[PDB]
Design an enzyme around this catalytic site. Structure first.
Site, PDB file in Angstrom:
ATOM      1  N   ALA B 166       0.819  -1.213   0.000  1.00  0.00           N
ATOM      2  CA  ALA B 166       0.000   0.000   0.000  1.00  0.00           C
ATOM      3  C   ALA B 166       0.856   1.268   0.000  1.00  0.00           C
ATOM      4  O   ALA B 166       0.564   2.223  -0.730  1.00  0.00           O
ATOM      5  CB  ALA B 166      -0.951  -0.007   1.198  1.00  0.00           C
ATOM      6  N   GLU B 167       1.897   1.325   0.841  1.00  0.00           N
ATOM      7  CA  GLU B 167       2.669   2.572   0.870  1.00  0.00           C
ATOM      8  C   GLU B 167       3.452   2.769  -0.417  1.00  0.00           C
ATOM      9  O   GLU B 167       3.623   3.906  -0.865  1.00  0.00           O
ATOM     10  CB  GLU B 167       3.617   2.634   2.069  1.00  0.00           C
ATOM     11  N   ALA B 168       3.932   1.686  -1.020  1.00  0.00           N
ATOM     12  CA  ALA B 168       4.595   1.796  -2.313  1.00  0.00           C
ATOM     13  C   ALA B 168       3.613   2.153  -3.422  1.00  0.00           C
ATOM     14  O   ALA B 168       3.991   2.853  -4.369  1.00  0.00           O
ATOM     15  CB  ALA B 168       5.330   0.494  -2.653  1.00  0.00           C
TER      16      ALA B 168
END
Lengths: 70, 283, 70, 70, 70, 67
Positions: B166-168
């Site tokens: 998700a953060e990537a």
């Protein structure tokens, strides 16, 4: 004690010139003049603040507060 | 909607992320080059999710293939994880509105905040190491996990997997830094304070970037971008702010100051000081 | 001497009228109220600060600090 | 009483060093010095404020104000 | 005289409570406390400042400064 | 009287601790210290300021409007 850790939901300048913030559903006031702009800046940027005081019931006073980025 | 994130190679990983972004978001008119953009998540109804199947932890091998992440689509939060071998969805306490059919849903006592996860994990994100090896370890920890309350190892696994999925997806910067760990050299990715700050400022960034019209810079709290290549190299997907994370207070997304686009709340937070002599002497 | 250089990780006002900042993993404090808005603005804007002091031990007080946008 | 809740439509520094804000179409003045930059920052970011006073007619004074996140 | 004109390259709070700015490669200090946050705001926002003084040698003092936007 | 109305074209801290702003082509100064941050903020965020004074030299009344 660690009374509250959260974003400032509202702030209020009080009649007696103290300053109140609502954090994690509880209200805390401070008479520390230095803290008034700092607390508003925290509210403006959604900083997580940690209110520390000897009593943590809503309506307690404080003089110790940490300003976090997370 | 199901997608695979395949960790076999840098190619397969970046390809996976790009395909997800293309399906769930739409490029900003003013922050887009070729097919590489800052994109806004397309509106879905509240509670909509997509599934991510984790693949390629062992390069190009059909093993370690029973982990699925459930991701709330409007905000890219990981709502929990599915053991597809046991057909069990372990769901964080802040996602009781996320309903997944066909699985056994285990409603957890643990919430998904980074504060909680870092505490239970005894692991701070700043300085957190992620490697192919620790993603395999994380996978095994999540497949071994049972019960309604996150353990230390399950929490470490979630911290690592949320960062690289998700953060990537949100941040091309994290995609770029982490993907080196997937190469044959198998180096270690170390999450930096700057990476962490990006994740913490995602909502604020999301409120500001739709206003960008080619200004020389963008300033959002501690985050600064000096040109479009810095924006594109850092940010890939933002919230649709036209979500509660879009607004802190007030109603003014930006102020243009000296050809820099400022988050208005940042400027307000250093323009609210009274006269310094009066401040310091009024104790 | 340059004690610490980096962005401000957190800041904190203490009941004993000291103001702590954490920079590059190290904590220092100042009781100069002048520095409270300056430091907090530096924290919320991501300035690089350089804490300077004659001696740089942990928990040291300071009253010299450089502010850089980068 | 809660006299006016809304954004600050203008603010004004006055000859007697009081400070006026127009909220919900009514003007209110305060002699609380510390409120001057706090109100102006609220004004610039569109922060909702709640003016609290004994009288709510335009031209009334206040010494208490809540800064909201609406 | 106009000693220096340009953006603030760095600012620095000093142990004697004076405040240094570097502008166009030259350093100047002021003992006017009111200038500390104003200069910081200028530095943060890339204002062009003009340091004005009867002595323009680097390392000299100043108490007059103009602030310009782009 | 409204002495001047417009954006702050420049501001200046003066050696006598007063503060000058240029608005609509005219310069005005104030000795009120708390107006120093208020004016600089208005200059940075692009507020329209209205300088007011019995004689339109020094001022100590000014209105701030967002643009």
């Amino acid at each position: 004690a660690d009374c509250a850790k959260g974003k400032i939901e509202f702030s209020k300048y009080n009649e007696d010139d103290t300053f109140t913030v609502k954090v994690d559903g509880k209200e805390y006031w401070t008479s520390r003049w230095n803290l008034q702009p700092l607390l508003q800046s925290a509210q403006l940027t959604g900083m997580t603040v940690t209110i520390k005081s000897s009593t943590c019931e809503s309506g307690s006073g404080f003089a110790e507060v940490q300003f976090n980025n997370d | 909607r199901e997608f695979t994130i395949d960790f076999s190679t840098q190619q397969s990983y970046v390809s996976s992320l790009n395909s997800i972004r293309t399906e769930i978001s739409t490029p900003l008119e003013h922050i887009s080059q070729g097919t590489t953009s800052v994109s806004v998540i397309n509106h879905t109804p509240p509670g909509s999710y997509f599934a991510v199947d984790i693949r390629g932890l062992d390069v190009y091998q059909a093993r370690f293939d029973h982990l699925r992440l459930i991701i709330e689509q409007n905000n890219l939060y990981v709502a929990g994880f599915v053991n597809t071998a046991t057909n069990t969805f372990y769901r964080f306490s802040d996602f009781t509105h996320i309903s997944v059919p066909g699985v056994t849903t285990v409603s957890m006592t643990t919430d998904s905040s980074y504060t909680t996860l870092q505490r239970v994990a005894a692991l701070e994100r700043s300085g957190m190491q992620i490697s192919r090896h620790s993603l395999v370890s994380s996978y095994l920890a999540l497949m071994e996990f049972s019960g309604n309350t996150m353990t230390r190892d399950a929490s470490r696994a979630v911290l690592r997997f949320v960062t690289v999925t998700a953060e990537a997806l949100r941040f091309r910067q994290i995609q770029r830094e982490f993907r080196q760990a997937l190469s044959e050299t198998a180096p270690v990715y170390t999450m930096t304070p700057g990476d962490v700050d990006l994740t913490l400022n995602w909502g604020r960034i999301s409120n500001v970037l739709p206003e960008y019209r080619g200004e020389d810079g963008v300033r959002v709290g501690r985050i600064s971008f000096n040109n479009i290549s810095a924006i594109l190299g850092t940010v890939a997907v933002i919230l649709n702010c036209h979500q509660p994370e879009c607004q802190i207070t007030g109603d003014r997304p930006v102020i243009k100051i000296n050809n820099t686009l400022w988050e208005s709340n940042t400027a307000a937070a250093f323009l609210n000081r009274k006269s310094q002599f009066l401040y310091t002497t009024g104790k």
